[PDB]
């Protein structure tokens, strides 16, 4: 097993996957690492199994169809994984916790959003469709773009949104386009 957390790349109190060499801090894994269960399989392994059980799940999909899916167990898992993929980028630190807004010449967003709030929402099963989760994710970056205007700090929102969107297309097998 790896000697660092797959998500935050630090050592500490780690839980090891039994089916692959990844390791996790308790609350870096999503969902939080389960109390018992021997053997234990991580989210990367659980996502791989879905694909292996239904190879055709990797054929291309339209985003509009994906968004309307109900949050059944397999779509819940895919959203948890997509969330985890964003936390895997160190630039996710800027979007993790509750923001505040007091900048000359800007007003804060009408509906603030941050990664830990989406994490809790997923944990508490507050999304009924994929669209709910993806809307809150995109809102994080859109709020940041609007607030920071022409400050070059806006680019952090662009950068982390690109990680989100690449992973969204991969995890949900969105049809490749030009
Ligand atoms: Zn970690
Ligand atoms: Zn694993
Ligand atoms: Zn099948």
């Amino acid at each position: 097993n790896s000697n660092i957390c797959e998500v935050c790349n630090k050592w500490g109190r780690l839980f090891c996957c039994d089916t692959c060499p990844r390791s996790f801090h308790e609350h870096c894994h999503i969902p939080s690492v389960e109390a018992n269960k021997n053997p234990w399989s991580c989210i990367f392994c659980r996502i791989k199994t879905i694909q292996e059980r239904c190879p055709e799940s990797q054929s291309g999909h339209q985003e509009s169809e994906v968004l309307m899916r109900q949050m059944l167990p397999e779509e819940q898992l895919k959203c948890e994984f997509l969330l985890l993929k964003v936390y895997c980028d160190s630039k996710s630190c800027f979007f993790a916790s509750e923001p505040y807004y007091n900048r000359e010449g800007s007003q804060g967003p009408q509906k603030p959003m941050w990664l830990n709030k989406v994490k809790t929402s997923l944990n508490e099963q507050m999304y009924t469709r994929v669209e709910g989760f993806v809307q809150d994710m995109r809102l994080i970056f859109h709020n940041h773009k609007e607030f920071y205007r022409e400050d070059k700090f806006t680019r952090l929102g662009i950068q982390v949104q690109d990680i989100f969107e690449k992973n969204f297309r991969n995890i949900f097998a969105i049809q490749e386009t030009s």
Side-chain angles (χ1 to χ4, degrees), residues 3 8 21 40 57 68 70 75 83 90 110 113 133 150:
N3 309 337
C8 78
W40 177 76
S57 73
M68 289 315 305
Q70 292 177 23
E75 304 309 295
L83 181 53
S90 59
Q110 303 291 307
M113 194 46 63
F133 165 80
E150 309 301 291

Side-chain angles (χ1 to χ4, degrees), residues 61-70 75 129-131 134 168 172-174:
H61 300 80
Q62 294 303 105
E63 175 173 314
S64 58
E65 176 266 323
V66 169
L67 298 185
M68 289 315 305
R69 296 182 191 167
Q70 292 177 23
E75 304 309 295
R129 285 171 202 275
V130 174
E131 183 171 55
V134 175
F168 172 72
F172 287 93
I174 298 295

Side-chain angles (χ1 to χ4, degrees), residues 25 27 33 41 65 90 95 120 128 142 144 176:
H25 295 97
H27 297 322
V33 174
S41 262
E65 176 266 323
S90 59
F95 299 109
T120 294
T128 58
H142 190 257
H144 178 101
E176 285 276 305

Side-chain angles (χ1 to χ4, degrees), residues 33-36 38-175:
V33 174
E34 295 73 31
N36 211 281
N38 319 51
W40 177 76
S41 262
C42 86
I43 193 160
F44 292 79
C45 286
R46 295 170 66 194
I47 292 285
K48 190 205 298 306
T49 296
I50 304 316
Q51 290 172 24
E52 289 175 353
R53 289 184 162 146
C54 285
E56 70 276 32
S57 73
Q58 302 157 270
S59 298
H61 300 80
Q62 294 303 105
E63 175 173 314
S64 58
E65 176 266 323
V66 169
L67 298 185
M68 289 315 305
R69 296 182 191 167
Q70 292 177 23
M71 288 283 251
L72 294 178
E74 296 194 335
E75 304 309 295
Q76 176 79 28
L77 191 77
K78 283 179 178 207
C79 291
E80 294 163 345
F81 186 52
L82 175 47
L83 181 53
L84 173 137
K85 285 291 184 140
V86 170
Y87 280 97
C88 288
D89 194 284
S90 59
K91 295 156 174 285
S92 72
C93 68
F94 298 112
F95 299 109
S97 78
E98 190 175 359
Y100 68 87
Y101 299 96
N102 193 2
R103 179 192 196 245
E104 185 182 323
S106 294
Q107 276 296 329
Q110 303 291 307
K111 184 174 166 191
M113 194 46 63
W114 56 100
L115 298 164
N116 297 341
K117 189 179 175 62
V118 175
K119 185 176 287 192
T120 294
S121 295
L122 272 178
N123 179 242
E124 292 176 8
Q125 296 159 313
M126 300 289 299
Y127 301 113
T128 58
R129 285 171 202 275
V130 174
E131 183 171 55
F133 165 80
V134 175
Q135 287 166 342
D136 284 349
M137 297 293 286
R138 288 173 171 166
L139 183 58
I140 296 175
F141 316 115
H142 190 257
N143 284 350
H144 178 101
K145 288 168 110 162
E146 296 301 287
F147 185 72
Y148 290 108
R149 303 288 196 121
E150 309 301 291
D151 194 299
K152 71 194 172 164
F153 192 58
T154 64
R155 177 165 177 257
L156 272 298
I158 293 162
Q159 288 171 324
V160 179
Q161 190 161 7
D162 198 41
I163 296 300
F164 171 74
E165 291 298 346
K166 280 180 194 278
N167 285 278
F168 172 72
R169 293 190 304 267
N170 176 264
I171 290 165
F172 287 93
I174 298 295
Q175 174 57 52

Side-chain angles (χ1 to χ4, degrees), residues 5 7-10 24-25 28:
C5 184
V7 180
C8 78
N9 302 106
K10 296 292 189 290
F24 304 80
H25 295 97
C28 281

